[PDB]
Design a protein around this motif. Structure first.
Motif, PDB file in Angstrom:
ATOM      1  N   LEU A  91      -1.208   7.241   1.709  1.00 12.59           N
ATOM      2  CA  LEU A  91      -2.640   6.913   1.710  1.00 12.59           C
ATOM      3  C   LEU A  91      -3.039   6.078   2.932  1.00 12.59           C
ATOM      4  O   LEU A  91      -4.189   6.152   3.367  1.00 12.59           O
ATOM      5  CB  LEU A  91      -3.088   6.254   0.391  1.00 12.59           C
ATOM      6  N   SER A 121       0.839  -1.237   0.000  1.00  9.97           N
ATOM      7  CA  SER A 121       0.000   0.000   0.000  1.00  9.97           C
ATOM      8  C   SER A 121       0.857   1.263   0.000  1.00  9.97           C
ATOM      9  O   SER A 121       2.009   1.251   0.449  1.00  9.97           O
ATOM     10  CB  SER A 121      -0.943   0.008   1.214  1.00  9.97           C
ATOM     11  N   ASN A 122       0.275   2.351  -0.501  1.00  6.23           N
ATOM     12  CA  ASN A 122       0.891   3.668  -0.482  1.00  6.23           C
ATOM     13  C   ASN A 122       0.932   4.170   0.975  1.00  6.23           C
ATOM     14  O   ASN A 122      -0.129   4.310   1.625  1.00  6.23           O
ATOM     15  CB  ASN A 122       0.065   4.583  -1.407  1.00  6.23           C
ATOM     16  N   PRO A 178      -7.943   2.787  -3.351  1.00  8.69           N
ATOM     17  CA  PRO A 178      -8.213   4.139  -3.837  1.00  8.69           C
ATOM     18  C   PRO A 178      -8.440   4.119  -5.354  1.00  8.69           C
ATOM     19  O   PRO A 178      -8.077   3.134  -6.025  1.00  8.69           O
ATOM     20  CB  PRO A 178      -6.938   4.896  -3.476  1.00  8.69           C
ATOM     21  N   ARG A 218      -6.227   7.009   5.323  1.00 10.68           N
ATOM     22  CA  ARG A 218      -7.189   6.025   5.782  1.00 10.68           C
ATOM     23  C   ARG A 218      -7.298   5.971   7.317  1.00 10.68           C
ATOM     24  O   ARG A 218      -8.408   5.841   7.843  1.00 10.68           O
ATOM     25  CB  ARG A 218      -6.938   4.648   5.150  1.00 10.68           C
TER      26      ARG A 218
HETATM   27 CL    CL Z   1      -2.934   2.481  -1.302  1.00  7.54          CL
END
Ligand code: CL
Length: 131
Positions: free
Chosen positions: A5, A1-2, A53, A9
């Protein structure tokens, strides 16, 4: 995952919100490393608190965006209504609480998004300024 981001979240979960909608090309580049000048066309980054996303761009930007972005990217061509297209491509429009960038989003775009999302909109700019 980023990583960045993941922070958004967490923020959404802490605020009991389900969705952040980014519109400012500068914030989107900060978050994803893709920089766009959309001109008069639509550009949105949809960051769900739980789902993948989604980047929404003009069709002409899809190829460039996809080189830097591994999560879902959708385009719309000029013969398509962008608001109908967002409705068609997104996994979910049922968020009760939404965050958006009130310092960038114009009133027409805000009203456009409200034809899709019936939830309550809150200001994201305090989060953005604090990154
Ligand atoms: Cl992400």
């Amino acid at each position: 995952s980023n990583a960045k981001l993941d922070q958004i979240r967490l923020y959404l979960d802490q605020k009991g919100a389900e969705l952040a909608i980014f519109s400012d090309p500068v914030t989107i580049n900060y978050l994803t490393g893709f920089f766009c000048d959309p001109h008069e066309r639509q550009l949105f980054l949809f960051v769900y608190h739980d789902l993948a996303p989604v980047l929404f761009v003009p069709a002409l930007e899809v190829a460039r965006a996809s080189q830097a972005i591994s999560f879902p990217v959708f385009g719309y061509v000029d013969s398509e209504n962008p608001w109908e297209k967002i409705k068609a491509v997104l996994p979910n429009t049922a968020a009760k609480t939404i965050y958006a960038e009130f310092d960038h989003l114009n009133v027409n775009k805000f009203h456009g998004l409200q034809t899709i999302f019936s939830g309550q909109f809150n200001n994201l700019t305090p989060y953005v300024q604090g990154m």
